Every structure is written in structure tokens, then in C-alpha cells.
Amino acid sequence: GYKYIQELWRKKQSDVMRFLLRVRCWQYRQLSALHRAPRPTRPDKARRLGYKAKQGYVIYRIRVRRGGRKRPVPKGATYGKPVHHGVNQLKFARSLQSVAEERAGRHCGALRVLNSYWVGEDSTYKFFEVILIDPFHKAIRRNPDTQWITKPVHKHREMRGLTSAGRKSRGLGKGHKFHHTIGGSRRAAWRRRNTLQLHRYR
Amino acid sequence: FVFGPTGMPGPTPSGTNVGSSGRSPSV
Amino acid sequence: TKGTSSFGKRRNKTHTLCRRCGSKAYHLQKSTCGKCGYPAKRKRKYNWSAKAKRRNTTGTGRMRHLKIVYRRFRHGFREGTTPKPK
Amino acid sequence: SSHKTFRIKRFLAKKQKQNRPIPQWIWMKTGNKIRYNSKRRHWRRTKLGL
Amino acid sequence: KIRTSPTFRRPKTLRLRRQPKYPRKSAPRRNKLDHYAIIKFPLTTESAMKKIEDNNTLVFIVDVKANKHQIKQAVKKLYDIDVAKVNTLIRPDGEKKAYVRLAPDYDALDVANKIGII
Amino acid sequence: AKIKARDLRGKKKEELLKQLDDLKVELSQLRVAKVTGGAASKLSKIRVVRKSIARVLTVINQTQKENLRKFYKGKKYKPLDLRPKKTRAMRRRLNKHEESLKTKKQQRKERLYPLRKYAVKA
Amino acid sequence: SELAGHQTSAESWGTGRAVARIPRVRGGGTHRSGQGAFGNMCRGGRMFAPTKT
RNA sequence: CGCGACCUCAGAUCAGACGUGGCGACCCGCUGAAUUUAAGCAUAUUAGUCAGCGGAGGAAAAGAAACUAACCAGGAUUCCCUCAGUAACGGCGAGUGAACAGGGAAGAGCCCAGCGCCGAAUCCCCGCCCCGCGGCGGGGCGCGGGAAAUGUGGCGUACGGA
RNA sequence: CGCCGUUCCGAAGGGACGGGCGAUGGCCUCCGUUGCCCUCAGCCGAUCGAAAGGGAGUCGGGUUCAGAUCCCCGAAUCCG
Ligand SMILES: [Mg+2]
Ligand SMILES: [Mg+2]
Ligand SMILES: [Mg+2]
Ligand SMILES: [Mg+2]
Ligand SMILES: [Mg+2]
Ligand SMILES: [Mg+2]
Ligand SMILES: [Mg+2]
Ligand SMILES: [Mg+2]
Ligand SMILES: [Mg+2]
Ligand SMILES: [Mg+2]
Ligand SMILES: [Mg+2]
Ligand SMILES: [Mg+2]
Ligand SMILES: [Mg+2]
Ligand SMILES: [Mg+2]
Ligand SMILES: [Mg+2]
Ligand SMILES: [Mg+2]
Ligand SMILES: [Mg+2]
Ligand SMILES: [Mg+2]
Ligand SMILES: [Mg+2]
Ligand SMILES: [Mg+2]
Ligand SMILES: [Mg+2]
Ligand SMILES: [Mg+2]
Ligand SMILES: [Mg+2]
Ligand SMILES: [Mg+2]
Ligand SMILES: [Mg+2]
Ligand SMILES: [Mg+2]
Ligand SMILES: [Zn+2]
Numbered sequence A: 001g002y003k004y005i006q007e008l009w010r011k012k013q014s015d016v017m018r019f020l021l022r023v024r025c026w027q028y029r030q031l032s033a034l035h036r037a038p039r040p041t042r043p044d045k046a047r048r049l050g051y052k053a054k055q056g057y058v059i060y061r062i063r064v065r066r067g068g069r070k071r072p073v074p075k076g077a078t079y080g081k082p083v084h085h086g087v088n089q090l091k092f093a094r095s096l097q098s099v100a101e102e103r104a105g106r107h108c109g110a111l112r113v114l115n116s117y118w119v120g121e122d123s124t125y126k127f128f129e130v131i132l133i134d135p136f137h138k139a140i141r142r143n144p145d146t147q148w149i150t151k152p153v154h155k156h157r158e159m160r161g162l163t164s165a166g167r168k169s170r171g172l173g174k175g176h177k178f179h180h181t182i183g184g185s186r187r188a189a190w191r192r193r194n195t196l197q198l199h200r201y202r
Numbered sequence B: 001f002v003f004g005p006t007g008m009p010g011p012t013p014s015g016t017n018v019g020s021s022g023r024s025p026s027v
Numbered sequence C: 001t002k003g004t005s006s007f008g009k010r011r012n013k014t015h016t017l018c019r020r021c022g023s024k025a026y027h028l029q030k031s032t033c034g035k036c037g038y039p040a041k042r043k044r045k046y047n048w049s050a051k052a053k054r055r056n057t058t059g060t061g062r063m064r065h066l067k068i069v070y071r072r073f074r075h076g077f078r079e080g081t082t083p084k085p086k
Numbered sequence D: 001s002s003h004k005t006f007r008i009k010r011f012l013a014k015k016q017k018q019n020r021p022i023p024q025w026i027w028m029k030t031g032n033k034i035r036y037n038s039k040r041r042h043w044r045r046t047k048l049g050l
Numbered sequence E: 001k002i003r004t005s006p007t008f009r010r011p012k013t014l015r016l017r018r019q020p021k022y023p024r025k026s027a028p029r030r031n032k033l034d035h036y037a038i039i040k041f042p043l044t045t046e047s048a049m050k051k052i053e054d055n056n057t058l059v060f061i062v063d064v065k066a067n068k069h070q071i072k073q074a075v076k077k078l079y080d081i082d083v084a085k086v087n088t089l090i091r092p093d094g095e096k097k098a099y100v101r102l103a104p105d106y107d108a109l110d111v112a113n114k115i116g117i118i
Numbered sequence F: 001a002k003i004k005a006r007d008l009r010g011k012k013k014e015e016l017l018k019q020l021d022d023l024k025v026e027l028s029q030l031r032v033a034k035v036t037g038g039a040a041s042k043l044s045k046i047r048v049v050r051k052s053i054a055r056v057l058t059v060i061n062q063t064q065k066e067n068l069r070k071f072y073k074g075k076k077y078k079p080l081d082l083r084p085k086k087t088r089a090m091r092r093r094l095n096k097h098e099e100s101l102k103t104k105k106q107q108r109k110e111r112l113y114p115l116r117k118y119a120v121k122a
Numbered sequence G: 001s002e003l004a005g006h007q008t009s010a011e012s013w014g015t016g017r018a019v020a021r022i023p024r025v026r027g028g029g030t031h032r033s034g035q036g037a038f039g040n041m042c043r044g045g046r047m048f049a050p051t052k053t
Numbered sequence H: 001c002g003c004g005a006c007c008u009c010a011g012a013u014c015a016g017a018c019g020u021g022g023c024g025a026c027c028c029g030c031u032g033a034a035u036u037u038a039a040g041c042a043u044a045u046u047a048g049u050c051a052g053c054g055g056a057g058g059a060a061a062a063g064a065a066a067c068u069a070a071c072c073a074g075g076a077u078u079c080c081c082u083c084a085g086u087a088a089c090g091g092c093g094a095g096u097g098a099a100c101a102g103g104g105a106a107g108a109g110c111c112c113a114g115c116g117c118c119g120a121a122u123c124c125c126c127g128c129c130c131c132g133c134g135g136c137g138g139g140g141c142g143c144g145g146g147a148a149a150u151g152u153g154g155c156g157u158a159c160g161g162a
Numbered sequence I: 001c002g003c004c005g006u007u008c009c010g011a012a013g014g015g016a017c018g019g020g021c022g023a024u025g026g027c028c029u030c031c032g033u034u035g036c037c038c039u040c041a042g043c044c045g046a047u048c049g050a051a052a053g054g055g056a057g058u059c060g061g062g063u064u065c066a067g068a069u070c071c072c073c074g075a076a077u078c079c080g
Helices: A003-008 A016-028 A043-048 A096-107 A186-193 C050-054 C066-075 D006-017 E049-055 E068-078 E108-115 F013-036 F046-071 F106-112
Strands: A034-037 A057-064 A112-121 A126-133 C015-017 C024-027 E039-042 E057-062 E083-090 E096-102 G010-012 G023-025
Touching: A003 A043, A016 A112, A016 A126, A034 A096, A057 A096, A096 A112, A096 A126, E039 E068, E039 F013, E049 E057, E049 E096, E049 E108, E057 E068, E057 E108, E068 E083, E068 E096, F013 F046
Parallel strands: none
Antiparallel strands: A034 A057, A057 A126, A112 A126, C015 C024, E039 E057, E057 E096, E083 E096, G010 G023
């Protein structure tokens, strides 16, 4: 059609896309940290991630500060064995995109997070856009293609790590690389491996 | 018509005081 | 002087009855309760006191609406009906 | 003090009305064990918290 | 229309009034502080019988949430007696005693004679 | 006279509020008899009149509520008191029609490939 | 039970005090105050090797 | 100057909804020790455990392979026996430590975007008509209002499909 | 979870006189009402913080077993 905007948004090192990503990043850097967008900045990436252009679908733009997770402790002094004297070079286990989806999914707690995507970044900020669905509209309630999002099991998909950006952080998957999450999750594997089955007859 | 007696409560005292004033220094 | 003498100066109270939990732990200066953190929306409770929870849980009080929800449950929360009249 | 508040005058009033003995006709009941009132309070010994 | 002041102040827009499509609660809650609930019973103590006899007053144990206005207008309904003034005080028991002083012509001793306390 | 709730349902709103405004005066005169000192025959009538007032106000609120939910019988929005009150999660479900809704793709699968009933020989 | 005998908070008083060095219940103006808390020997307390399921 | 669009953005006690807090045995996402073991101790161990924070459901999570294999090949997830105290990790010290295959409990698959095709063929809202009416719907009207071409609905999804 | 922050990255005033338009109730005379524009408006930060700071206005005499600048009598006074 969308397949032109798609292959265009892959030459981010080009001239046109390095001008656009820069005027976009400048304009985003002037607004609030979490503000509602009028329409999806990337309409193609939004369709690909499940955004039907109909009432009820909401797009929030949100910026997050880049960099690792300095340990929250007093001056230095993380009292423990030298193993855990690390404060500076530590990293967070959830992607900045998963932190964007839950800073939107918490600021606006009525809406259900579907997905999110990258719309720009600079040295000190990363800008994402979160596809929030209003689960009590009738364009979503009645349409049976998307009435799964309205059941109480999917409350705060991103606080429970069920979105795409979240699921990418739990190391789950099929293969010889993802053995430590056989079962539900890493802790449901850990439980069964660290659980002593004591039969009646031994 | 049998009348009744009475009853009054009071906090239970606990013995933990130790003056430890006595000193026997002999190096 | 740190003892019996300076036990007389105690005349102005630190805490008063909290309005959310009725316990005498509302720090008048810090303006927050030490028992439930009243000005905060979330009731404060920590796992490191297994016993302080059992003093404030859904059974400890009247359950004036739960003891009826547990009764309306045995019939799927029927509504707008009455038994057949005499 | 004498500069009470309403919430406190009312709590003291409740603590005044809880401070009376069991009616004598109440341990001639059938399923009875209460010999006397044990939750009583004296203003001198026990100091009502607060 | 020139900008005379260098401060862009927010323009005042229009504000409608609530035209609901359905009242939230179905019926207005009845006034539970009735003229009858506002006066529980009188006192028959020689501290109040000297008020009735000498001061030409009456002593009621009114509800605690009652004003001197509600009391005045609730003795002028249950007993049909114009009232000079009302002086309330909350007892250590918890109830609100109220000394109601009757108009000059009305006789307390003879309006307590009626209602029973005498 | 034993005031039963049955013979209170035919009477009119003001033929009920006159009974209420008479029972409250009978209370006031009994709470006075209690403090002036009266016969137990009177003292024991307090529990009888407090419950007669309870019966009256009960029939008043019941007839008024029935009239209300008749007035809003067929309307779309009705007061949150007349709306069916079940558990919050039970009120925030999908209708039986939204549950019973199917996409045209599944109304076509269910039609072209129904679940056949069969047996096998042993 | 697995919690029986351990639902209290009690630390030994230590040497001195002319007391038998068993843990003891903390403070309080009650009978059960500095009274011996854990161990099979004490009243209340936990039994030796609590039977398991 | 004014007028009329559109975009972006405010204001409402605007009409109608929604969230918040509690419980927490089980479950999901992060954060995360030190007692102790090593006859000391610093890596390791305790342990991704206790504490801490957030979010749910009657189950949750996972789930129809960017899989296992190297066979004469198997075929979503979860669970049990077994593999196995194994391969491997480790001051190769203390100690730690899976998976595949196989036998079982259960057993079920699917759906979009995209690429094209169709006169937007789609959806929400208010007013009136008749019913249904205590899980707010069915059918009819409205030169009634909107959403939507910056893409709604039907066919269709890797097992190929038109 | 929340913390920081208190005029700081803010479209932060829902108010007033007069006028014009519109409606309303009555000596519908003449005021009052509320709807719409026109004109005008600084502020300086929501709110809390003192029974000893600031803070208009009550004194005499009588009386109870326990209350009086509080009740009774008699003299005033402030605010609206
Ligand atoms: Mg971690
Ligand atoms: Mg990756
Ligand atoms: Mg202090
Ligand atoms: Mg909590
Ligand atoms: Mg004392
Ligand atoms: Mg389809
Ligand atoms: Mg025991
Ligand atoms: Mg509204
Ligand atoms: Mg060691
Ligand atoms: Mg050792
Ligand atoms: Mg050591
Ligand atoms: Mg270590
Ligand atoms: Mg924990
Ligand atoms: Mg919650
Ligand atoms: Mg539930
Ligand atoms: Mg699930
Ligand atoms: Mg397998
Ligand atoms: Mg073996
Ligand atoms: Mg390990
Ligand atoms: Mg296998
Ligand atoms: Mg089988
Ligand atoms: Mg399409
Ligand atoms: Mg596939
Ligand atoms: Mg103040
Ligand atoms: Mg002052
Ligand atoms: Mg002063
Ligand atoms: Zn509290």
C-alpha cells in the first residue's frame, strides 16, 4: 500500500528519516513526560501491533530517561559481601519500553495496554507510544474480535508482564536456550526443581 | 435475690530492675 | 536525673486516636498514623509481623457486608424476587 | 484537661457508661458464667490510655 | 483586538449546568431528625424542678445533633408553646441536656402539668 | 390493637403518615411515662410501638420503591438504587448477547464443519 | 502445628540477672512477661522435634 | 478586518461510563540480603531465598515451534514417573545441577496486520414506535448527529491463499 | 508504593461597575433576578499551622448540696 512507510521507517540512518526523527524528538522533548497523542505517529507500526482506527483506541506518548539503574542506597555503603558492592554499573531487568507501558498503564488505570512502540530517542530520553484500549466502550465490547481485552484476567497486562515488551524480559520461549522457564515462568520452574516430591510410599 | 461480691484489677508487676551499683575492680 | 526526676516533665502527648483505625498512633507533628499510615491511601502492613496482621483482617471486625455476600452467594445473588405468597 | 474536644468528651462518656457493675438479675440466668464485672476501671490505677 | 497586556490569560469559555438523564438515588432520603426524634424525654430531678418552678423553664434530653433552632421549632410543634430562649449543654453521659425558657405569659409548671412531668 | 403489615398495604400514603404521626406521639408519651414512672403495662408497650413504627415505615418504603421501579420499568437509565445490585465484578461483565456474539468467520466455520455424532466398531 | 511455640518474640536476657539463660518473653505488664518462651522444657513453648506430616 | 475549514491544544457540577481501596494460601512482574556452610575468608554457598514494591484469577502463568533431534525421525502448553544426583558448573573446595528421548494425566485449536478484492460494503450516540423487560437487548423509522479514506467490515494468514 | 518541590518548565481570574441584547416576578411602575456579549481586573500561590502571638463586642447584685462575666433580676454593648 503501508509497505512503503514500512521500508521507509527502516532507513533511519538516511537523510529524510534523520531529519524527521530529529524534529519529532525535539518536539516531543518539549511536551510533558506523559501526554495523550491525537493519532498514532506510526500508523503502520500501530496496525502491526494491533491498532484498529476506531473509537476506544487511545495512543499515549511517553518519555523515559535512558541509562541503567543506580542502586538506591545511602552514600555508598551497600552493607554486604564484596559481591554486592555494585551500585553504578547495574542494569535493570525490564526494558525501558516495559517501563513506558506501565507508566502509561498506571497513570491511566481504566484503559488496558495492548502494545507500544518506539518513536524517537536522544542522549537522555527515549520516546514511546502506548496503544491503550478503553475496555468499556461498545465499539470494543460488542465487536467480538477484541472483547478478550475486556475480561478481568487481563487487568494491567504490563504490571503482570504479558505485553510484548514485557514478555521479552521474562526469558520465556521454546528451545534449548530457554530451559530455566519450563513451566509458567522462571519462578514456576524454580519451584518444581526446588521442591521435594514426597510420595506416600516413597 | 442472692446479692454479689466485687472485684478490682491491677497491672501485673514484672521484676527486671538491676541496680548493679556494686563494683569490685581488682586487676 | 535521667530517671525518676525527668519522668515528671511528661505532659504533652505525641500521638492521638487515628480516625481510620481508632488506635492511639496519629503522630500530631508528622500528621500521619504509625499503625495504618492514614494520610496515605494504602493501609500499611508488613509481612515481618505475622501477628500484627491477624489483629486487623477481614474477619476481625463486623463484616457487615461480607457476612451477607457470603449468604447471597449460595443462590447466585438472586434479585428482584420473593417467595410465592401464601 | 478542661479544654476537651467533642470526640474526646464523647469517648470519655462511653468510658463512663461502660464502668458500671453487672445487673444482679443477670447471673440467675441459665447459661451463665459471669460472676462479676472484670472489665471495670478505676481512674487512679488504670489510665484509659489516651 | 490588540494585546494590551503581555500576559496571555486563559479565555473564559461557557459552562453548562447538570441536566442529568436520571437521578442517581431514586428517592430523597426522609429526614431522620424528625421533630419527635429531636426530643427524647424530660428530666424530673430537683435540679430541673427548681428550673421549672422558679425559672419557668423545662429540661429536655434532646438529640445531640440538634441546634437551639431545631429545638425551639420542635417544642413549638410538639407542645405549641412559644419559647423565650434555649441553652444546651452536652452531659458527661453523652446526651445533650437543653434548658428551654418559655415566653413570659406561658407557664412552665402548667405546661409540664399537661405533658406529665410534675 | 395488633398492627399487622397485611392491612397496611391498601391504605393511602397520607392514611399511613397519619398513623405514623400518631405512633410517634404514643412513643413520646411512653418515653415520658418511663421517666415519670409508670406501670410495666406501659413500659412494655415501647417495644410494641417502636415495632409498629417499624412496620409502618417499612410498608411506606416498600410501596414507594415498587412505584419507583414501576415508573422506571421500561426506561433506559434508572437510579442506581433500582439498577440490579450484584457483585461489582458481576455487574462489570459482558451481556448475554455480547457473550452469545460470533464473528461472521466463526458463524461460517460452525456452519460448514459441524461436530458430527458417530461411533466406531469394536 | 509448625508455628506452635514460635508465635512469640523472645530473646534471652543473658548472663547476670540470676536467671537461667533460656529465652524470655519481652517486657509487658502481664503474667507472660519474661517467662521462658521456646524449648521443650518451658511451659507454652515448642515440643522436641515437632512431629511432621 | 471578517468569514469557513482542518490540525494541535484547553475549559466544564457538560450526557453516559470506567479506575482507585481490601484480601493475599496459591499465581504474575520487579527489587533483593545477611545469619549459615566452606571447620578461617574474600569468589562460591545460603539464594534469585527472607524482607520490600506493583497486579490479578478461581485458578494464574505458559501455549499451537524462528522447537527437539541426527532417527526407519518426533510435533502447542501444563503436570507426574524416569532420564538423574546425570551432562555440566565450581578457591573443580564446600558444594551446586538441568534438558532430550521414553511411559503416563489431559488433549483443541486458532486470529490479525501486511499483500489484493470489493461504490465504507463498517461502527458508536441520540429522538420517536412495539415488544423484551432483575446479565440493557430485537425488529422499524429519522434529508438525526458523529467515528472512519492518517483505513472500518467481509474473504483471507504460512497447514499456503486469491 | 511514592518522593522531590511551594512560584518553580503552567491557557493558574468563574469575579466586578457600567453599557447593549434576552428572559422573569410582582403597585408589571420601578427596583430585584438570572442568560449573552462589551469594558475592567495584577499579583503570588490550594490548604493547614497558636485554647499564652494578632483578633469588634458584658458589667453589677442575687442564687446551688455541686454551675455561673453562662442561670434570675437590672443596666449596656458589638456584628449582620
Ligand atoms: Mg533481578
Ligand atoms: Mg532480544
Ligand atoms: Mg514533638
Ligand atoms: Mg499493601
Ligand atoms: Mg498516676
Ligand atoms: Mg477477519
Ligand atoms: Mg504448646
Ligand atoms: Mg456529568
Ligand atoms: Mg565460615
Ligand atoms: Mg565454625
Ligand atoms: Mg567468622
Ligand atoms: Mg558469596
Ligand atoms: Mg517476600
Ligand atoms: Mg488492587
Ligand atoms: Mg475474585
Ligand atoms: Mg491465561
Ligand atoms: Mg516436550
Ligand atoms: Mg541411577
Ligand atoms: Mg543456584
Ligand atoms: Mg519429552
Ligand atoms: Mg491417556
Ligand atoms: Mg483490511
Ligand atoms: Mg505458525
Ligand atoms: Mg487556620
Ligand atoms: Mg488565639
Ligand atoms: Mg490569644
Ligand atoms: Zn491509623
